[PDB]
């Protein structure tokens, strides 16, 4: 059985479930003030100073019962706006409120995205709380602060300034049409850091006073010196000056927590709660300046860095990385010297899930509901191989899984870097947690990941050693890492840590089924009446012609979006470069270059994101089968049948976003034959060579396509293929597709999952289909499976689940994650969500409380194929 | 005053927080929000000596630095290095 959560953990979760997601203004106000007050300062130092101020001038909040402390803001599920990055999703709203007129309508991507109305979300203003971006409650008295903080950013946020330059690209109009149709889900500026892996090395190794002295030393050495480098030589000095500034910031911030802990202790009448406050004052007082000296301090320090970075930009997917390896030295020393017992370590790891679970991403609804479903993807990876190529599993990683079992929360999602070298007992332990249906650990192929790492980053020198240090940025965005020598406890440990910027930025989710749609409708978006692409006016006379027209539209799309998103990120890295992450990420400090100037070791991270891969492959299958090979229907017949939703009522009327329910209006018999032919055509995920060959060809084409483009870092793009929640929105704006999927309904989840209800040859046939190409050609490949709980009963059931994972991993499969649930339960939770406040399911790369997931994704998850054995 | 204006208040979210002393959840607005006799003023720009001139929305002038800037009354001041209780 699973031990009860600790008392502290229980009291804090009781509080947690009542909390409301809250945007406030402190960080924003202070960032903006310090920014302009330093107008004229060298940009790196001006940036650093303003981030520093935004952290170290906030109200620090400490809760009773906490051992680990800090939060993004003074609120618990807190965040704040970044009008210097983007503001358009809230400033018209905000100004409409001051003026007491009607709030304007959302933009299209936002409007086709749903934020789950339950749990913590504030999707509607109430009392004195304004709902900002359909999710965040901000107090009415702050609305004026939001407006006044945002005003100086008119024309010059990353958003608006990059928009001015994008308007000078020849493809601007095309690009704008693509965004308005939601063919491209969102703009890179939305979240310019994240989908990467933080690197905790520097403060764990030096402490902030250590780091400040290192900056002093570098400044003395290089300020005013270029060496032989007339591009960046001189910039080294300002980089070290800026780092000293952000480090002073992080130190002040910690001190503020220390002082608040001291106050709370002084009034604490309950001696037990007083003890913690006292330990906290000391712990925060210490990590403000010294190298951490025990596990509590070391883990607390990783939180300071993590909150540090997610407060310097709006972002999701700042992966924690391999915390169990990073902190093994601090753990083992405490246990050895008897400073901590394991159960005390487990309490800290339990409390830590809470802290990470409350991290919010303030951003537009399109991102927060449309993509994230509110989750912020702080992914903790486990295992793989260490610097010396042996199993990296540490004893501390077992406790991380244990904490995950005892304190069941959405984050951090756990990710096993499955490697044949991994001990069986850790795999079985990991499996026993997955079989619980929390959705973690998910399972990712260490070997395939390292393979992608060597291939993609080969040109930048990637060797076997850094390759081994990889893990998942955000959900699945395989991200560069390296090992660095941490000295502690009289020995050196090569601990891992990320080594690139964002690996989930570039050309964002392109709804491939919707692009196919527009091939068939000659560029015209029939959902909206807008001509999106230039009409090709080609007779769709063959399969090859239709696929070539698809490719042509995918290449235009990729070209214009790429050029605009480069400008977005380039304005950002030049006027808004990372301060905290530029201190932490190697090799910034060693080179004297921030992230913006390619200080990170690995910079080939920018990518192209597909979406709807299986919906798309299955549509091609159907068209080729029904129209071009068997010639049973004409391409006009198919197209009309799709535009007409095969006679069924649309999800725009019924609000059912899966195959689960079709209101069978009388025009259905009119299309019953073609509809059945479409449902019946070969379907990906059945080891069916007809469908699987199309899927394979798609892979070789898409690899070739993406690598012809160049990111702002001057590196070829590669493919990222996940869905997150994006199949919600891009599904929504897509009419019925030729695979028999109906209008407005979600695309297929993930990218190698079978389309729901179409896998009919068992899980293994899905494995065979998925692996018809080599997964390391791309960054990842995302598979979801759902198992009925009876399917994994008993320790035998744990073993059976692990053998299922091993089978797919050994075929080369990149990833699989599981739901273990009874879909009838989820159906029930949908009817009455008040009754399941703690219910979680796995969506795609994340676990979320049901009550905070929108109907389209809920429906989608309900309808996923449920495996009984 | 309200809990919200007290130094003992622990922030939770946009509607409620904790009283540090009782450890019970307390509201920001409405019935139940008023200060208790144990109240100790929380440090805010609204109650700083450097804070002046606020408009109807609480937005006024910081003179904490020789160059004046704007500030807002409900801004937490406990971590402002120039904060001075009025
Ligand atoms: O943060 C995450 O990992 C989710 C996510 C992934 C890719 C993307 O582009 C946006 C959000
Ligand atoms: S006003 Fe009194 S001590 Fe202050 S938060 Fe506690 S009950 Fe309100
Ligand atoms: S000096 Fe500090 S606390 Fe005082 S009004 Fe100015 S910003 Fe606020």
Tab-separated table of N, CA and C in Angstrom, chain B residues 5-81:
chain	number	residue	atom	x	y	z
B	5	UNK	N	-5.030	44.472	5.043
B	5	UNK	CA	-4.100	45.566	5.350
B	5	UNK	C	-3.161	45.231	6.517
B	6	UNK	N	-3.332	44.053	7.113
B	6	UNK	CA	-2.516	43.590	8.231
B	6	UNK	C	-1.235	42.840	7.857
B	7	UNK	N	-0.228	43.012	8.697
B	7	UNK	CA	1.074	42.398	8.470
B	7	UNK	C	0.984	40.898	8.741
B	8	UNK	N	0.014	40.487	9.564
B	8	UNK	CA	-0.168	39.079	9.904
B	8	UNK	C	-0.910	38.290	8.795
B	9	UNK	N	-1.460	39.006	7.808
B	9	UNK	CA	-2.209	38.390	6.721
B	9	UNK	C	-1.210	37.608	5.892
B	10	UNK	N	-1.560	36.384	5.481
B	10	UNK	CA	-0.774	35.565	4.512
B	10	UNK	C	-1.581	35.490	3.217
B	11	UNK	N	-1.009	35.984	2.138
B	11	UNK	CA	-1.696	36.002	0.869
B	11	UNK	C	-1.959	34.599	0.335
B	12	UNK	N	-3.163	34.346	-0.187
B	12	UNK	CA	-3.363	33.087	-0.900
B	12	UNK	C	-3.680	33.386	-2.349
B	13	UNK	N	-4.758	34.141	-2.580
B	13	UNK	CA	-5.249	34.381	-3.937
B	13	UNK	C	-6.040	35.698	-4.007
B	14	UNK	N	-6.700	35.926	-5.129
B	14	UNK	CA	-7.363	37.174	-5.385
B	14	UNK	C	-8.592	37.404	-4.489
B	15	UNK	N	-9.054	36.398	-3.725
B	15	UNK	CA	-10.253	36.552	-2.875
B	15	UNK	C	-10.026	36.372	-1.377
B	16	UNK	N	-8.977	35.653	-0.971
B	16	UNK	CA	-8.838	35.336	0.429
B	16	UNK	C	-7.385	35.099	0.790
B	17	UNK	N	-7.095	35.064	2.090
B	17	UNK	CA	-5.755	34.803	2.581
B	17	UNK	C	-5.850	34.136	3.939
B	18	UNK	N	-4.734	33.985	4.659
B	18	UNK	CA	-4.787	33.403	6.001
B	18	UNK	C	-4.441	34.424	7.054
B	19	UNK	N	-5.103	34.345	8.190
B	19	UNK	CA	-4.606	35.084	9.305
B	19	UNK	C	-3.458	34.272	9.878
B	20	UNK	N	-2.267	34.853	9.957
B	20	UNK	CA	-1.124	34.149	10.551
B	20	UNK	C	-1.440	33.709	11.993
B	21	UNK	N	-2.112	34.557	12.762
B	21	UNK	CA	-2.359	34.231	14.157
B	21	UNK	C	-3.326	33.039	14.333
B	22	UNK	N	-4.498	33.089	13.700
B	22	UNK	CA	-5.504	32.026	13.852
B	22	UNK	C	-5.223	30.874	12.888
B	23	UNK	N	-4.476	31.160	11.827
B	23	UNK	CA	-4.276	30.196	10.738
B	23	UNK	C	-5.560	29.823	9.974
B	24	UNK	N	-6.605	30.627	10.163
B	24	UNK	CA	-7.874	30.439	9.494
B	24	UNK	C	-7.964	31.312	8.256
B	25	UNK	N	-8.726	30.848	7.275
B	25	UNK	CA	-8.874	31.543	6.012
B	25	UNK	C	-9.766	32.747	6.224
B	26	UNK	N	-9.328	33.915	5.748
B	26	UNK	CA	-10.077	35.175	5.886
B	26	UNK	C	-10.289	35.883	4.539
B	27	UNK	N	-11.417	36.600	4.395
B	27	UNK	CA	-11.756	37.209	3.109
B	27	UNK	C	-11.115	38.569	2.936
B	28	UNK	N	-10.969	39.012	1.685
B	28	UNK	CA	-10.434	40.336	1.405
B	28	UNK	C	-11.564	41.378	1.495
B	29	UNK	N	-12.707	41.046	0.900
B	29	UNK	CA	-13.853	41.934	0.830
B	29	UNK	C	-14.979	41.383	1.648
B	30	UNK	N	-15.877	42.260	2.059
B	30	UNK	CA	-17.166	41.794	2.488
B	30	UNK	C	-17.202	41.380	3.934
B	31	UNK	N	-18.337	40.797	4.309
B	31	UNK	CA	-18.548	40.304	5.648
B	31	UNK	C	-17.342	39.473	6.053
B	32	UNK	N	-16.801	39.758	7.230
B	32	UNK	CA	-15.694	38.977	7.752
B	32	UNK	C	-14.322	39.532	7.432
B	33	UNK	N	-14.241	40.636	6.679
B	33	UNK	CA	-12.943	41.185	6.228
B	33	UNK	C	-12.276	42.205	7.169
B	34	UNK	N	-13.051	42.839	8.035
B	34	UNK	CA	-12.519	43.877	8.928
B	34	UNK	C	-11.396	43.411	9.869
B	35	UNK	N	-10.578	44.365	10.293
B	35	UNK	CA	-9.399	44.086	11.094
B	35	UNK	C	-9.818	43.648	12.488
B	36	UNK	N	-9.022	42.786	13.110
B	36	UNK	CA	-9.254	42.409	14.493
B	36	UNK	C	-8.318	43.211	15.406
B	37	UNK	N	-8.600	43.252	16.728
B	37	UNK	CA	-7.833	44.161	17.596
B	37	UNK	C	-6.333	43.899	17.581
B	38	UNK	N	-5.929	42.703	17.140
B	38	UNK	CA	-4.521	42.297	17.072
B	38	UNK	C	-3.832	42.836	15.844
B	39	UNK	N	-4.545	43.659	15.096
B	39	UNK	CA	-4.034	44.195	13.854
B	39	UNK	C	-2.694	44.923	14.015
B	40	UNK	N	-1.789	44.656	13.074
B	40	UNK	CA	-0.494	45.334	12.937
B	40	UNK	C	-0.372	45.730	11.462
B	41	UNK	N	-0.247	47.031	11.165
B	41	UNK	CA	-0.262	47.434	9.753
B	41	UNK	C	0.850	46.785	8.896
B	42	UNK	N	0.404	46.146	7.844
B	42	UNK	CA	1.309	45.627	6.810
B	42	UNK	C	1.965	46.788	6.054
B	43	UNK	N	3.245	46.647	5.716
B	43	UNK	CA	3.964	47.740	5.044
B	43	UNK	C	3.543	47.852	3.560
B	44	UNK	N	3.017	49.014	3.174
B	44	UNK	CA	2.595	49.262	1.793
B	44	UNK	C	2.940	50.689	1.309
B	45	UNK	N	2.984	50.917	-0.013
B	45	UNK	CA	3.334	52.269	-0.481
B	45	UNK	C	2.298	53.294	0.070
B	46	UNK	N	1.052	52.867	0.181
B	46	UNK	CA	-0.014	53.685	0.678
B	46	UNK	C	0.309	54.167	2.069
B	47	UNK	N	1.123	53.422	2.804
B	47	UNK	CA	1.500	53.918	4.121
B	47	UNK	C	2.983	54.188	4.290
B	48	UNK	N	3.602	54.633	3.209
B	48	UNK	CA	4.999	55.045	3.230
B	48	UNK	C	5.119	56.567	3.276
B	49	UNK	N	6.106	57.076	3.988
B	49	UNK	CA	6.363	58.514	4.022
B	49	UNK	C	6.691	59.101	2.654
B	50	UNK	N	7.301	58.302	1.778
B	50	UNK	CA	7.674	58.749	0.451
B	50	UNK	C	6.491	58.768	-0.531
B	51	UNK	N	5.375	58.137	-0.151
B	51	UNK	CA	4.231	58.014	-1.055
B	51	UNK	C	3.252	59.192	-0.927
B	52	UNK	N	2.901	59.809	-2.057
B	52	UNK	CA	2.035	60.992	-1.998
B	52	UNK	C	1.117	61.156	-3.226
B	53	UNK	N	0.156	62.072	-3.152
B	53	UNK	CA	-0.635	62.442	-4.324
B	53	UNK	C	-1.498	61.358	-4.956
B	54	UNK	N	-2.053	60.393	-4.217
B	54	UNK	CA	-2.692	59.354	-5.048
B	54	UNK	C	-4.005	59.797	-5.707
B	55	UNK	N	-4.339	59.207	-6.856
B	55	UNK	CA	-5.581	59.513	-7.586
B	55	UNK	C	-6.684	58.582	-7.091
B	56	UNK	N	-7.870	58.638	-7.695
B	56	UNK	CA	-9.019	57.872	-7.175
B	56	UNK	C	-8.755	56.380	-7.046
B	57	UNK	N	-7.879	55.869	-7.915
B	57	UNK	CA	-7.460	54.436	-7.971
B	57	UNK	C	-6.238	54.063	-7.150
B	58	UNK	N	-5.708	55.000	-6.370
B	58	UNK	CA	-4.589	54.676	-5.488
B	58	UNK	C	-3.225	54.854	-6.136
B	59	UNK	N	-3.213	55.438	-7.328
B	59	UNK	CA	-1.995	55.602	-8.111
B	59	UNK	C	-1.499	56.981	-7.802
B	60	UNK	N	-0.315	57.041	-7.191
B	60	UNK	CA	0.347	58.284	-6.890
B	60	UNK	C	1.842	58.283	-7.099
B	61	UNK	N	2.521	59.041	-6.254
B	61	UNK	CA	3.887	59.464	-6.511
B	61	UNK	C	4.840	58.957	-5.436
B	62	UNK	N	5.850	58.199	-5.859
B	62	UNK	CA	6.970	57.847	-5.010
B	62	UNK	C	8.062	58.914	-5.075
B	63	UNK	N	8.511	59.359	-3.910
B	63	UNK	CA	9.606	60.314	-3.798
B	63	UNK	C	10.778	59.656	-3.084
B	64	UNK	N	10.681	58.345	-2.902
B	64	UNK	CA	11.786	57.532	-2.414
B	64	UNK	C	13.127	57.844	-3.059
B	65	UNK	N	13.110	58.199	-4.339
B	65	UNK	CA	14.339	58.567	-5.040
B	65	UNK	C	14.252	60.013	-5.520
B	66	UNK	N	15.400	60.641	-5.753
B	66	UNK	CA	15.429	62.045	-6.139
B	66	UNK	C	14.589	62.258	-7.377
B	67	UNK	N	14.652	61.312	-8.306
B	67	UNK	CA	13.767	61.322	-9.463
B	67	UNK	C	12.439	60.689	-9.063
B	68	UNK	N	11.366	61.464	-9.091
B	68	UNK	CA	10.077	60.942	-8.685
B	68	UNK	C	9.536	59.948	-9.715
B	69	UNK	N	8.772	58.966	-9.248
B	69	UNK	CA	8.100	58.014	-10.130
B	69	UNK	C	6.750	57.714	-9.603
B	70	UNK	N	5.975	56.942	-10.351
B	70	UNK	CA	4.639	56.609	-9.877
B	70	UNK	C	4.673	55.308	-9.061
B	71	UNK	N	3.653	55.104	-8.270
B	71	UNK	CA	3.559	53.969	-7.356
B	71	UNK	C	2.085	53.770	-7.040
B	72	UNK	N	1.730	52.611	-6.485
B	72	UNK	CA	0.327	52.319	-6.169
B	72	UNK	C	0.208	51.888	-4.723
B	73	UNK	N	-0.842	52.415	-4.071
B	73	UNK	CA	-1.059	52.348	-2.629
B	73	UNK	C	-1.113	50.918	-2.096
B	74	UNK	N	-1.693	49.999	-2.834
B	74	UNK	CA	-1.780	48.648	-2.322
B	74	UNK	C	-0.516	47.835	-2.647
B	75	UNK	N	0.515	48.474	-3.208
B	75	UNK	CA	1.783	47.787	-3.482
B	75	UNK	C	2.479	47.400	-2.176
B	76	UNK	N	2.982	46.168	-2.073
B	76	UNK	CA	3.579	45.715	-0.829
B	76	UNK	C	4.934	46.377	-0.720
B	77	UNK	N	5.297	46.811	0.476
B	77	UNK	CA	6.442	47.690	0.640
B	77	UNK	C	7.448	47.035	1.553
B	78	UNK	N	7.121	45.842	2.027
B	78	UNK	CA	7.932	45.188	3.041
B	78	UNK	C	9.323	44.888	2.485
B	79	UNK	N	9.430	44.769	1.166
B	79	UNK	CA	10.753	44.520	0.537
B	79	UNK	C	11.243	45.696	-0.319
B	80	UNK	N	10.704	46.891	-0.079
B	80	UNK	CA	11.244	48.064	-0.767
B	80	UNK	C	12.343	48.665	0.091
B	81	UNK	N	13.539	48.812	-0.473
B	81	UNK	CA	14.616	49.268	0.401
B	81	UNK	C	14.439	50.683	0.949
